[PDB]
Amino acid sequence: SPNIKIFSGSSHQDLSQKIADRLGLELGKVVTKKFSNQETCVEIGESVRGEDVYIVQSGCGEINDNLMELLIMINACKIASASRVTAVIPCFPYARQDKKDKVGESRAPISAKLVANMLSVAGADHIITMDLHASQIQGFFDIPVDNLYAEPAVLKWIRENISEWRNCTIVSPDAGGAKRVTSIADRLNVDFALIHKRMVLVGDVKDRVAILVDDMADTCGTICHAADKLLSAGATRVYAILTHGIFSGPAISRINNACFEAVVVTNTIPQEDKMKHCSKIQVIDISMILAEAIRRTHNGESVSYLFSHVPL
Amino acid sequence: PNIKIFSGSSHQDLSQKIADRLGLELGKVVTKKFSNQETCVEIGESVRGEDVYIVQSGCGEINDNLMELLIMINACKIASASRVTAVIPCFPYARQDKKDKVGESRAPISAKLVANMLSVAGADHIITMDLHASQIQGFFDIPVDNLYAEPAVLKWIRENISEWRNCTIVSPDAGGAKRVTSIADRLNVDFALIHKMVLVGDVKDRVAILVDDMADTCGTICHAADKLLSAGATRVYAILTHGIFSGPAISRINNACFEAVVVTNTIPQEDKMKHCSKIQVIDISMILAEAIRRTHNGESVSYLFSHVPL
Amino acid sequence: PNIKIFSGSSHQDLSQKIADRLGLELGKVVTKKFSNQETCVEIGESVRGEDVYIVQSGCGEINDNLMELLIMINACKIASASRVTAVIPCFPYARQDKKDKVGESRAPISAKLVANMLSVAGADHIITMDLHASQIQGFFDIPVDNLYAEPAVLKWIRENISEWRNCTIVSPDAGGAKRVTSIADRLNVDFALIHKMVLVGDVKDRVAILVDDMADTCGTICHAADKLLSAGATRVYAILTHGIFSGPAISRINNACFEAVVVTNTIPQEDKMKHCSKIQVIDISMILAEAIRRTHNGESVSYLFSHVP
Amino acid sequence: PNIKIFSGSSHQDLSQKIADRLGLELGKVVTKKFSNQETCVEIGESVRGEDVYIVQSGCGEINDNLMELLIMINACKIASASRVTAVIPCFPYARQDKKDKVGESRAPISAKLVANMLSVAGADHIITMDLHASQIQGFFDIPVDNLYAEPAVLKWIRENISEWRNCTIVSPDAGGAKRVTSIADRLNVDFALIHKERMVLVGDVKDRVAILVDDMADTCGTICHAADKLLSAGATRVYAILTHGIFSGPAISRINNACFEAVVVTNTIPQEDKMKHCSKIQVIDISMILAEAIRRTHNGESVSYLFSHVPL
Amino acid sequence: PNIKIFSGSSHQDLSQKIADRLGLELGKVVTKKFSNQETCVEIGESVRGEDVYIVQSGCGEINDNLMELLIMINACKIASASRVTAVIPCFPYARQDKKDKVGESRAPISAKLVANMLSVAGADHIITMDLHASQIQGFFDIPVDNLYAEPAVLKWIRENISEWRNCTIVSPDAGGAKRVTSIADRLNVDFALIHKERMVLVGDVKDRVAILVDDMADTCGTICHAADKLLSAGATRVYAILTHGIFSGPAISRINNACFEAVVVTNTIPQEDKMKHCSKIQVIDISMILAEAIRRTHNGESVSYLFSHVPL
Amino acid sequence: PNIKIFSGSSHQDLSQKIADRLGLELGKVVTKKFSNQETCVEIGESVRGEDVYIVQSGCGEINDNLMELLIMINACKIASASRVTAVIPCFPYARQDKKDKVGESRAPISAKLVANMLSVAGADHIITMDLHASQIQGFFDIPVDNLYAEPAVLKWIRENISEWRNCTIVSPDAGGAKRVTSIADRLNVDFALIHKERMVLVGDVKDRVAILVDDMADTCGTICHAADKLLSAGATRVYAILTHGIFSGPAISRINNACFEAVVVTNTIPQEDKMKHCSKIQVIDISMILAEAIRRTHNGESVSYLFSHVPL
Ligand SMILES: O=P(O)(O)OC[C@H]1O[C@H](O)[C@H](O)[C@@H]1O
Ligand SMILES: O=P(O)(O)OC[C@H]1O[C@H](O)[C@H](O)[C@@H]1O
């Protein structure tokens, strides 16, 4: 039916607008502030009674304030008798678990499940997200989660922006990133190689373009060395492509000092501020991927809508 | 023999005071934030089978402290702690804002959300002090102890206000009526109430004590104190259990006519006392320590919290 | 086009008034007790796929009416109703009668229990009026509408108390301060409040209106009215949303000095108005009917309940 | 070593009887009603860390007693009781008069709702006797103990009816067949069954003592008509033995005008007042059976405490 | 206009018969087992926003079928179906193999477990036929329909047993009393009962056709011994009518050797294979009852619908 | 002093080995299937107030075993067991067969379903070994211990492969990269990776012993093609060490035909039968890891038991 409303957090508003543009809608009116004493203030500026509500709130920026803002907004819509509340969380907070593997066993994803449980008790009915650090986070909920992939937009950018892409190779910065890399190399019909930590390279990278692909970049320590090792192995030029560009701490300083031809991230986190101080950052717009998932969750057009059919 | 106390980053000083009163050292925990702002918690010691009490207040950067508390509770619960208790001296998000919607009331969304998050994190029990509304106790299905600072406030009044026997308990707004009427009856004294500004009750030529549950920006308590000065009150005091003091509060109090502003230690005050000569704190760590004692139930089924002399 | 209203045994006059305001007949239901005291409920019509509103107040034998309500809600939910809303004008069990225990405070056991039973029975939504404490709204996870009689009380004051422009709004105890301060601000009048008995404020030679959310045994409101007479108030009124009037209340009011005791229809008053002449009732069916109209959402997304008179 | 027993207003002679047998005095509780008929409960002593048993029957003013029970259970849980067990000798709402909408069956709601209330109040364990249908045990997620009166009835038969070795056991309706056949097999006697629709008897009753056995007697229309039919078939004398003696409405008048030698019930429901107006009612005491189930629930003496070994 | 019927692997003919009666084709679904015995289910079409009914019986390899049912129910729920109904003609685990115990009764552990798994998988509604005990309805919090085969059995008796007006409806054991008295009352005929303790008969069967009626037949030892006893007591011809024909173990061998004129079952479990080795089996098709219940649950036609009125 | 280890039918060798290591006999339990395929469970001794551990693996007919585990857990829970732990060496349904959609991922319905059933049956704690994905730990709210066979594998390598100091740890696919580099880092040896698309190997294994390491082997098609590829690359001898030996379908025929010097599995699944038809299977006993985890869960020894410190 005709009852969709999009709201934005303070997390990232440019994207919230881009999605609404792609769907032909204006953003719902909402007051999101902080009181003097640090308490999150939310005021929904319009009736959501009977509406299909989508709240866009990345999990970047001051993460706990943004998370609290998201939970209050979701819960407020649910008690104002909204028909459905979907959290559109492009970058899911707390996905990563640096450990100290209790070598006899493994640690559990406390914080990712906590975040999931809070979304559930707040009253979220459905989650739309992008490239969960681990896809199993999908099973931390009982509500449907759509874990969308940036690979098609990356794959695109690669063919259109790297000339010798036909002859290149994709490298993984770490051990765990193999699947992703192998997926992209298989889709492109190119070679793959992987780096592991002193740091070692497995695979042929000599005299061909190397593309480091990973899910996110926070501190950037790892991709930077990886770029050094790829240069030492005789790669012509090195690129870095990450879906989530967190870039905290010394990250910006590291990339400018590193040998990257370009660092490509999607728009799931705001980059406008970071591009001002870093020339090698380029962004892939993923507003259509998200807009298309909201359009399909809404189910207003055809039941047999297939997500996979819409062009990019 | 299985009691463990842990502190968050919110308020270490009380956490130490409580552990002292119980003859315990604080459990080892690394509580920080990563580069990307995510709260990091690591329990540095075993809690398997232990009765764990986490002390965290809701002052400071409240959302970082709250998230840290939830991760600690949950982490303790999946580490097979026998019981996890959240000790939250000042409960965050308890005060509803609203424009007093007419025709109907707003709901305590954020206060219920905090309760819901504490429950799913795995809190088995909450110990707190002077909830903004006592009904917040009923937002949980686990037991909540809503402790009162009143006995310590009562003792402080008798010990520090020479003329306390002939004074008058003033409420800063219409809402705090039951608290001030409660204290005046306990002291066998008069009460008055202020509402925006008008004063109801006689306060001229007697010591006036403003009582409220908490003071944030302090605009209401300072205008009320002004009205009490213009109405001929000898000296005006402000007694609040929770001293948040955000924004211009310190500047407003120093410019205002208070003889003293008394708060408890439920929120850290050392920093604010360096910038305010008139803040005094009532230590309430024993009340909290005695409630923790009582939840643990290590001595007898029949220990009564009220039998312990302050 | 799927609304249905049903009545409990508790108050059927209001249930009819509400149904009238919505152009509806009450749904067919048999509500009795068996020989052995067990509540019998039989939904006499189909509720499959419908937006069901059960109107039941908590008065009379609260426990029989409450159990009856819970069985009706659950039966409708298991009969595959689209939505079941409990319309509870006077919420049972809200007042706390804790002997105080100063160290700390007792918890709303019975009020939380009632909320939990309504939820587990299968209530999707609560409509109620002037909850003893508005925080009871948060004892649920489903939406609760806590409606106010204040607008109807304001209107009644302006139309029936000639001197309302001057006057003064008195609270019977410390707890009702915020409620009386609310009405006085809406009316641009003075307030005072009574405690223990002591009076704080200025009754003078002005009309004093005692305002509180409910009157049970009426010991407090009648002593407050006496104190208001000793302070020289021209005439004393009592205005309460919930007129329970149990025990000696009716007898106490007749002996008291009230010019009138005004209550709303959230609880049935016909029997008690026969034994008390001072009781007048404010009809609130339009507030409840408008919350039901708004819950159903048949008109539009933006129907604002505050725009209707 | 921490067991506390509280009685409700439901039945106190029984709760005292249980307490005598365990060696305990009943815990202090104020259990009354306010002027507005709201139920008032106050726990007169600490239950912190205690294993609490609340005895409340499903008789009397059922909704008052039920609400009272729920408030006490909830109150003990929020006072940090270790465990709260509801001892409900006669489970309210078990029987459901309906009229199976030919083609289907009605569902048990009031018995399931009653179970759900016990659960949401905070009950950890139920002890009950002779549930109208044993499946009510599955209406809970907490353990339910459905004790049987059969052993006390078998004793009573062997010690109070002389010709018991050649007596017939008769079901007053079709639904009670299993219960009566079980007693006939234990006694090594014959049974017969009555069905109304005008009454029909299958089975031989001529010149033998007939014992009508059912789980409950309410209005007693059915057992009285069965008594007439049994005399019509030549039975020497007729007894009726029910577990729950509710006896509402015209029950006492019906039994005083019927041809019963005796009506035997348990004290799951108080009988002193009804016995004053009906010389035929006799009660068999079931306190020990309940006391023994509470002892086992508590688990004081041993892990391998077998409820089936204790003498009666 | 959003209704899909899907079939399990358990009984497809009924799934087809039901889909036919509603004018529908079965939804596309791949239901297999992997090499390693894990149940594989993959939904071949969109169910987003659709009213889904999964028909799976509790016949066959009960645990494999139960897992298949649970995975497709859950799969539909995470694919954002509006509602998912489990149509379970023969409810698994509904019969308790108690030793009854003395003193107390065991609990319906397995039947409640099945109920809890159906609920947690995401079932919104259950349609079933002749639950072994009607109380299983209360093991759920979602609606459950227990539908009866009695009207179809009543039709079959009148249409196929000519001397039906002077027959006897016999229960093979205690407990099946209410079922046989219900049918005897509908036909205005006599009833009798069999009990094992040596088998005993109460009621008259001499010179009249005896119809043994029960809810289900597993190993068939009781019904066959009962058939001998009905013959030795001088019944003209003996029939057996059961709603659920499981016929496991020696059942077929017992029936072929027994004196039954016919054993009549419904189609809730597939019989074609068993009819190939047993000639006395006749089947009553009940697809119209289940389909009509699916129609009424869907609520396509009218709120005032009531399936008591549909012909059969 | 409350430990009871009970065994399922799925693998009792381990159940005995675990109980032996703890100085205990297995609890008495009857675990069978009825004629009609329904799972029968009867607890042969009291568990009231006891700490119960039920050992069942996801091997064999997985759905029958899972149903048996769930019924035992429930039976113990309704018998007022103090705590019930599921010890599930090989977690069923943990592997995803999605054939990933290109824009988003599939949810883990089955695994979570299994998790949800364990939870709703009443499991208080899960002990498992080398979960296919460690995130399954977060599918529960009860604690899950995901134990590693790595230390035991590390022992076996040093003890049985003499040139182990110069060997390579090879991953059969992209997913196991992180698993093999962890082992190579522990041994201070080289790693390599195999990938399909024709099969590629990145890294170097020539003239060195190659050890294929993976979490489980089902049908064994990948590890056997990988072993052939390792032979084409000049590996001295090829080993396979997987935690979980399912070996269904052609696995045994494939392994016997393959060039493996040895295929090493742990005892999480019974191997005696498969070893009779395959001479290259060797088993690592991991019974001490599970027993020590049960010891630590019981908490009978101290608060500091450190799983880390006990030697295997
Ligand atoms: O008065 P009637 O119901 O006809 O017969 C009385 C029965 O009603 C109740 O169900 C009890 O079982 C009584 O035996
Ligand atoms: O079944 P295939 O596709 O032939 O082989 C893939 C793998 O399936 C299991 O992990 C086996 O260990 C195999 O190596």
Side-chain angles (χ1 to χ4, degrees), chain B residues 96-134:
Chain B
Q96 257 130 110
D97 192 27
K98 98 182 119 165
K99 15 159 130 66
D100 300 46
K101 214 152 150 75
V102 65
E104 59 177 324
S105 83
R106 272 173 202 255
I109 309 171
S110 305
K112 180 53 179 302
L113 196 52
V114 174
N116 284 342
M117 293 174 41
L118 287 157
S119 303
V120 313
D124 299 311
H125 187 125
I126 308 103
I127 296 159
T128 194
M129 185 167 292
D130 293 302
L131 285 166
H132 179 70
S134 68

Side-chain angles (χ1 to χ4, degrees), chain C residues 35, chain D residues 95 97 132 172-173 196 214-225 242 246 250 254:
Chain C
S35 45
Chain D
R95 29 271 137 74
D97 126 274
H132 178 67
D173 54 29
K196 190 197 186 159
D214 216 13
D215 62 322
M216 213 177 83
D218 201 341
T219 61
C220 295
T222 304
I223 50 161
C224 287
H225 281 163
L242 304 320
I246 302 163
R254 290 190 172 154

Side-chain angles (χ1 to χ4, degrees), chain D residues 103-105 112 137 148 185 195, chain E residues 100 103 105 137-138 140 148 195:
Chain D
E104 37 181 348
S105 85
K112 178 56 183 299
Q137 278 199 278
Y148 302 147
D185 290 352
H195 164 62
Chain E
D100 218 333
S105 75
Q137 278 208 276
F140 297 83
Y148 293 166
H195 173 56

